[PDB]
Design a protein around this nucleic acid. Structure first.
Ligand SMILES: [Zn+2]
Ligand SMILES: [Zn+2]
Ligand SMILES: [Zn+2]
Lengths: 149, 46, 1097, 50, 66, 50
RNA sequence: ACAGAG
């Protein structure tokens, strides 16, 4: 029921744990992607019913399985020789619990993501920080003695 | 190879081929929805 | 000393919304129609009788409505949900079944269920499938639990019979004429005949005018026609004051000039003035007994009770000419509202009478002539007289009934599904009586009679300002009562009959009349005991609780209005400075021991009326009560309607701002309902991530707005930034729009039908036309699946086909031509679903549902929920924003120059209340005339470390150095409006032209082009630009050349003047085409525009 | 350059003057009501008593 | 329709805190305690969970299912 | 909607455009920013010379 | 024919 554009947008904002000093920029065009300048994840979730279900049948956690697509169902697919440049567990989405879609039995999601390298000025899904800011340091001073009550 | 349509109420495959009045084979519901395409489509994550 | 206060007094309003008000008005009128009025119309038309060949009759016995059905192809019948009737483009009706009794020689043959017609069943009425269901059973019908209902479904679209606003019938309007004279008139309307009578004083003597008389006859001759022959009794019935007799004298002096002294003479005088449709006497006596003042009844040609009424009219004219107390039409004691049931009653009565007349015509054709075998009329009950009448009168919007001379237009509108408020706001609209004839400025104002009955601010802005209105939150519209016990009670309370006295008792100082809907019930002394005893009999449960009573002490009348279609409002009774509702009663209501009807029965809450709250004295709050107060207002935020109940702190704003929000709040992008995905509409706008408001009115909780909202919480600094925010423009944030703020969806529609004709041939869809060179379909057929229909999930570019249709051109083998449905549009679109269904006539219906995601840009109109509407002007990055000490940099910078000349303080308090309510997890109420105060939200900011007035220390983002003034941060609930720039950009270089006038077409969909108006011609002349005015209005529209004969001045062709039969005087002239169109429309009119040309030096 | 609810709030210098001015105006209007209803009102030239 | 992944104003990842927010309202918290136990300091992150309506749980009830 | 008010004194023209407006002070007081989608459609006949 | 918008 989540649309395709909204699903692509929600997958656009999930942060990736890959170090961006090792990759390079994808050139203008170059729609395939090579070993140097991209990654590739694969989400595939099929939602069915539960073969054992109680007579009350109230909560969706008992009646169904894989009805909440989290970001832990993202599975990395290497390209070229990237299987040795990164050990098993350093290329993954970060927060392990981000809800993407939500399913009902008979509905299926399969897709193929292509991570690349980009600056934050282009789009706000490349910003490395939640928020970065500063303030000056205060110096409250007491001009006269404040005593008692 | 045949055109399989999805029924609206009972969600079952029907395969309407001959020139017939449109009706589900299993229920009496008379509205079909086409299935999704099998060709891939590309979206930008913006 | 303070009067003690009941604090839970508000809880009567959620008890009131269980039963009455808030589209339950439409439901209680449609159920009233299909449960009593369809029996009462059938009762008065129970028998048809053939003229020739008697002892033959068709007798109707009982009528029904029943459950909704569909009639499919192979005669199988099944019930149906309203959403299946939405998708397949069919009506949602139920068959009218009637049992009869007719004669075929054998004198008694009866039936049980003869289907004669199909009644469109309104949603959530008594015969709909949706009533009495649980919210988990609306899921199996594809219907929302919050969809209000009250609308019809006719041929696929949703149509609403709107509330009309009409003046009250059977009432003496004393008004001024155009020339300054004061007369009276009463539109004597009953169920059978409507007609207006007048009273003109054109010479100082009284005349009566009517649409039947060819001349206005004086009133004393009418009195002498109605059985009172003495002049003394006439002057008694008029009045016994000195100036009244002085004003009436020159009418007796006119009557004695003619020889009219006798009743038969007066009737012979009237009969010589009747426009013709025993003549002289009887066509005047039947006239005065059936048409003039036709609501005042004459029993057996006894004209006493009509003489008293017309003398009351003449006396009111005489008294109103002295002091100019004309009655205003705009007082809402005189307005009546007509719901959907009272229009469908008139429509079905006219259709049923035309059905009986057509059946009597068929009966008189086939009884005297054909055959001794007795026919039955069951073989002539054609169903398509009633069904198509109902569906065509609902779907088109006109109710042209010839019997009642009703010629209304524009009653039904398409129910707007822009947001949730737009569907609920349309079900409370009241169209007005005048309907935009001229700039009246008299009923377009806000009269004080609309207190609590209609909404102050909720009106459209433009040509219909004040002529389209909206009901309040706590109102109710009455229906027609049984009229039984009111007369039987009034006859036992001191009302003398009017027949037992002369006219002199009417002019006494201590004698008041009593009326019941226009008829005089007699006179009475001691009217206060009558009014108080009648109100006690209304409170004690004997008289029905909507029967109002009033007292016009100037005109000396005690009105009683049992009629239907007038506005009521509940109140709390106050007896000797204490409210009748205690804290114990509201605790008993909250625990569930009682309901609102128990408040009605125990004389605690009584319904008032606009005529009845002219007598009473009402206090707003409990500390306004003094000794002369009879009622207490329940809730003063019920003064505001439904669409103004979204505004927070709406009493701090200026009054046009609430009106502009009542206009913008029906256009905000949001969510329609819970079935917004299984729904295929012509146009549907959704928002991606909606959020419920942070500062909310109690009206929002009462209509369940925050279960499906329209808008998003924007963090808003109020400062001047970058100079692109000068007049109402607002600067967004590039890193907030990328994260999902303001993201919207646009769904459209594309339907295609495939019909089978009368000749046994059919439309058909071919497959995708392959290219043999590359074994792929061509680019214009790229997205087609093998069934010729576009498939869900693929992108649709411009001018690619969706349905590859082919129809026969029959105008032996079929000759097909291609007629495809092609996607026209500026940008690309996706497909979500393709629907396929069929009707019973072997027609196939295909509906697609397209989809576009639009991201906000320069040109998209946002709103503010206070009337501070504005387009976007600049989208800056997150780095160029100003920022706080905590790192919050705002999304929408707003210009502070909107606030002084518009005086919206409600936005300045919504911001502060939302900021103080997000820091500790509350929703601070912005309820009208109350809500969370300023002193309680200033103390929740200081507890969490912020400033007590919202103003925050801001380090800037361009320079890095702090700003001098403090900037005012907080969340404001901004809603996105439907006016986007991608659907308003338009540009025509040259394209398709019209056929008659060779100049470009009308609108954006036709690639139309813009218009040099009649006023922009007046501006190019002021500059003196002559060749620019020539280039715009001749060269770039319709430049053209004509063969002008210089000899005679006519127009030739190809150098050949067919008039002169010569070719030596033709010439070519630079002319516009709409002038050459003019020079040949006029030669057909025999107005010949003979030109004379000269050389062009 | 910003605006706020503290830019339109009345201080203590206004909430004492407003009360006295409202009381003076209400008492003078009550005196003119009482002088119209129960006797002599010094009528302005060219108008009625109301 | 569903909880957004990032807060709109700053950019903190909010869209994994929703199932924990309802779970901390199962255990009888006030909302000001749950938003502090999830770690939301600034108020722009607090309005993402505090003002969110869960329409997908009730739009999926009308979705087609076997 | 007659000839003399609808098709003669004022008539529908081409080479025109209608779009929502929005402020911009970085232009001069005698300039206007035409979008690219309108500037590709609205053309001008430029006669060729030396 | 109706609703909008400025
Ligand atoms: Zn089925
Ligand atoms: Zn000639
Ligand atoms: Zn945040």
């Amino acid at each position: 029921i989540v649309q395709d554009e909204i699903l692509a947008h929600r997958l656009g904002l999930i942060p990736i744990h890959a170090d961006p000093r090792l990759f390079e920029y994808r050139n203008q065009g170059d729609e395939e992607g090579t070993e140097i300048d991209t990654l590739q994840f694969r989400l595939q979730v099929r939602c069915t019913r539960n073969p054992h279900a109680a007579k009350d049948s109230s909560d969706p956690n008992e009646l169904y399985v894989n009805h909440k697509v989290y970001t832990r169902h993202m599975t990395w697919i290497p390209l070229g020789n990237q299987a040795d440049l990164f050990p098993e567990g350093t290329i993954r989405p970060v927060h392990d619990d981000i809800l993407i879609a939500q399913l009902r039995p008979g509905q299926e999601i399969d897709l193929l993501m292509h991570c690349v390298k980009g600056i934050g000025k282009d789009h706000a899904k490349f910003s490395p920080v939640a928020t970065a800011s500063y303030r000056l340091l205060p110096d409250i001073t007491l001009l006269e003695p404040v005593e008692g009550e | 190879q045949p055109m399989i349509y999805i029924c609206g109420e009972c969600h079952t495959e029907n395969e309407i081929k001959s020139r017939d009045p449109i009706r589900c084979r299993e229920c009496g519901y008379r509205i079909m929805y086409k299935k999704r395409t099998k060709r891939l489509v590309v979206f930008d994550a913006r | 000393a303070p009067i003690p206060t009941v604090e839970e007094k508000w809880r009567l309003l959620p008890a009131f919304l269980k039963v009455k008000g808030l589209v339950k008005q439409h439901i209680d009128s449609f159920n009233y129609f299909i449960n009593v009025e369809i029996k009462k119309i059938m009762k008065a038309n129970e028998k048809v009788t053939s003229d020739a060949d008697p002892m033959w009759y068709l007798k109707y016995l009982n009528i029904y409505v029943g459950l909704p059905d569909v009639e499919e192809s192979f005669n199988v019948t099944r019930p149906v949900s309203p959403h299946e009737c939405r998708l397949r483009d069919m009506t949602y009706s139920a068959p009218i079944t009637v049992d009869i009794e007719y004669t075929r020689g054998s004198q008694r043959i009866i039936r049980n269920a003869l289907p004669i017609g199909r009644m469109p069943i309104m949603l959530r009425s008594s015969n709909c499938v949706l009533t009495g269901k649980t919210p988990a059973e609306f899921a199996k019908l594809n219907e929302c639990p919050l969809d209000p209902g009250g609308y019809f479904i006719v041929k696929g679209v949703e149509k609403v019979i709107l509330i009309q606003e009409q003046l009250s019938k059977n009432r003496i309007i004393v008004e001024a004429d155009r020339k300054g004279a004061v007369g009276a008139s009463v539109t004597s309307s009953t169920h059978e005949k409507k007609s207006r009578t007048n009273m003109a004083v054109k010479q100082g003597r009284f005349y009566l005018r009517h649409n039947t008389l060819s001349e206005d006859i004086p009133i004393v001759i009418i009195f002498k026609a109605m059985g009172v022959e003495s002049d003394q009794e006439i002057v008694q019935m008029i009045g016994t004051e000195e100036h009244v007799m002085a004003a009436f004298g020159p009418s007796l002096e006119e009557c004695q000039k003619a020889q009219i002294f006798t009743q038969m003479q007066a009737l012979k005088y009237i009969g010589n003035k009747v426009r013709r449709q025993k003549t002289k006497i009887e066509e005047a006596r039947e006239l005065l007994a059936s048409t003039i003042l036709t609501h005042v009844p004459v029993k057996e040609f006894n004209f006493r009770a009509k003489c008293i009424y017309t003398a009351v009219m003449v006396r009111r004219v005489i008294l109103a000419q002295g002091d100019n107390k004309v009655d205003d039409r705009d007082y809402y004691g005189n307005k009546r509202l007509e719901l959907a049931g009272q229009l469908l009653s008139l429509l079905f009565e006219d259709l049923f009478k035309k059905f009986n007349s057509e059946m009597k015509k068929i009966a008189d054709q086939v009884i005297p002539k054909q055959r001794a075998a007795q026919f039955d009329v069951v073989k002539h009950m054609r169903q398509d007289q009633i069904t198509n009448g109902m569906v065509n009168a609902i779907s088109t919007g006109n109710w042209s009934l010839k019997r009642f001379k009703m010629d209304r237009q524009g009653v039904t509108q398409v129910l707007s599904r822009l947001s949730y408020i737009s569907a609920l706001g349309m079900m409370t609209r009241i169209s007005s009586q005048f309907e935009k004839t001229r700039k009246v400025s008299g009923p377009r104002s806000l009269q004080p009679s609309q207190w609590g009955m209609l909404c102050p601010s909720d009106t459209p802005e433009g040509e219909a300002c004040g002529l389209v209105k909206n009901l309040a939150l706590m109102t109710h519209i009455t229906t027609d009562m049984e009229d039984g016990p009111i007369v039987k009670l009034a006859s036992n309370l001191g009302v003398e009959d009017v027949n037992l006295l002369c006219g002199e008792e009417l002019s006494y100082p201590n004698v008041f009349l009593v009326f019941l809907n226009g008829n005089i019930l007699g006179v009475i002394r001691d009217h206060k005991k009558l009014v108080n005893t009648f109100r006690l009999m209304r409170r004690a449960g004997y008289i029905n609780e909507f029967v109002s009573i009033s007292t016009n002490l100037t005109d000396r009348c005690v009105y009683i209005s049992s009629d239907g279609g007038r506005l009521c409002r509940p109140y709390i009774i106050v007896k000797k400075q204490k409210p009748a509702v205690t804290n114990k009663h509201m605790e008993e209501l909250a625990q569930g021991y009682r309901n609102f009807e128990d408040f009605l029965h125990e004389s605690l809450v009584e319904y008032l009326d606009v005529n009845e709250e002219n007598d009473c004295n009402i206090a707003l709050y409990e500390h306004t009560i003094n000794k002369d107060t009879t009622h207490l207002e329940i809730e003063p935020f019920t003064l505001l309607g439904v669409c103004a109940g979204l505004i927070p702190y709406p009493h701090h704003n200026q009054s046009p701002r609430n009106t502009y929000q009542c206009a913008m709040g029906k256009q905000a992008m949001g969510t329609i309902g819970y079935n917004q995905r299984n729904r295929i509409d012509t146009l549907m706008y959704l928002l991606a991530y909606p959020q419920k408001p942070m500062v909310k009115t109690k009206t929002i909780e009462l209509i369940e707005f925050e279960k499906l909202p329209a808008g998003q919480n924007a963090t808003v600094a109020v400062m001047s930034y970058s100079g692109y925010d000068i007049e109402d423009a607002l600067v967004l944030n590039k890193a907030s729009l990328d994260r999902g703020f303001g993201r919207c969806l646009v769904y459209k529609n594309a339907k295609c039908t495939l019909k089978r004709y009368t000749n046994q041939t059919f439309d058909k869809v071919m497959g995708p036309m392959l290219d043999a060179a590359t074994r792929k379909p061509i680019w214009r057929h790229e997205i087609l699946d093998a069934d010729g229909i576009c498939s869900p999930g693929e992108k649709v570019e411009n001018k690619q086909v969706l349905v590859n249709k082919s129809m026969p051109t029959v105008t032996q083998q079929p000759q097909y031509k291609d007629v495809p449905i092609t996607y026209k549009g500026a940008t690309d679109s996706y497909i979500e679903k393709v629907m396929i269904s069929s009707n019973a006539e072997d027609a196939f219906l295909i509906k697609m549902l397209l989809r576009q995601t639009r991201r906000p840009e320069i040109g998209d109109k946002f709103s503010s929920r206070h009337g501070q509407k504005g387009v976007c002007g600049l989208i800056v990055p997150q780095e160029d924003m100003p920022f706080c000490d905590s790192g919050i940099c705002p999304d929408i910078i707003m210009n502070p120059h909107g606030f002084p000349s518009r005086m919206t303080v409600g936005k300045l308090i919504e911001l502060l209340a939302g900021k103080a309510g997000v820091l500790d997890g509350r929703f601070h109420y912005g309820t009208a005339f109350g809500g969370s105060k300023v002193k309680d939200v200033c103390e929740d900011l200081v507890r969490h470390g912020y400033n007590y007035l919202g103003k925050d220390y801001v380090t800037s983002g361009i320079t890095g150095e702090p700003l001098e003034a403090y900037i005012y941060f907080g969340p404001v609930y901004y809603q996105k409006l439907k006016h986007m720039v991608l659907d308003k950009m338009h540009a025509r270089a040259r394209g398709p032209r019209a056929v008659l006038t060779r100049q470009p077409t009308e609108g954006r969909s036709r690639d139309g082009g813009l218009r040099l108006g009649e006023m922009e011609r007046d501006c190019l002349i002021g500059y003196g630009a002559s060749m620019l005015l020539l280039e715009r209005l001749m060269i770039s529209s319709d430049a053209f050349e004509v063969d002008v004969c210089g000899q005679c001045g006519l127009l030739g062709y190809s150098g050949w003047c067919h008039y002169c039969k010569s070719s030596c005087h033709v010439s070519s002239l630079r002319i516009p085409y709409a002038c050459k169109l003019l020079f040949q429309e006029l030669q057909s009119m025999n107005i010949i525009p003979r030109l004379k040309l000269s050389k062009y030096n | 350059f910003s605006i706020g609810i503290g830019d339109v709030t009345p201080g203590q210098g206004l909430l004492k003057a407003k009360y006295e001015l409202l009381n003076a105006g209400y008492k003078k209007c009550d005196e003119y009501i009482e002088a119209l209803n129960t006797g002599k009102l010094q009528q302005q030239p060219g108008c009625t008593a109301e | 329709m569903i909880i957004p992944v990032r807060c709109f104003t700053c950019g903190k990842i909010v869209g994994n805190k929703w199932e924990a927010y309802l779970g901390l309202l199962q255990a009888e918290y006030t909302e000001g305690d749950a938003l502090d136990a999830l770690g939301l300091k600034r108020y722009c992150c607090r309005r993402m969970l505090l003002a969110h309506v869960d329409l997908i749980e009730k739009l999926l009830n009308y979705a087609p299912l076997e | 909607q007659g000839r003399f008010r609808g098709n003669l004194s004022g008539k529908r023209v081409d080479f025109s455009g209608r779009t929502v407006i929005s402020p911009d002070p970085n232009l001069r007081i005698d300039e206007v920013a035409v979008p690219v989608h309108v500037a590709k459609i609205l053309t001008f006949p430029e006669k060729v010379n030396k």
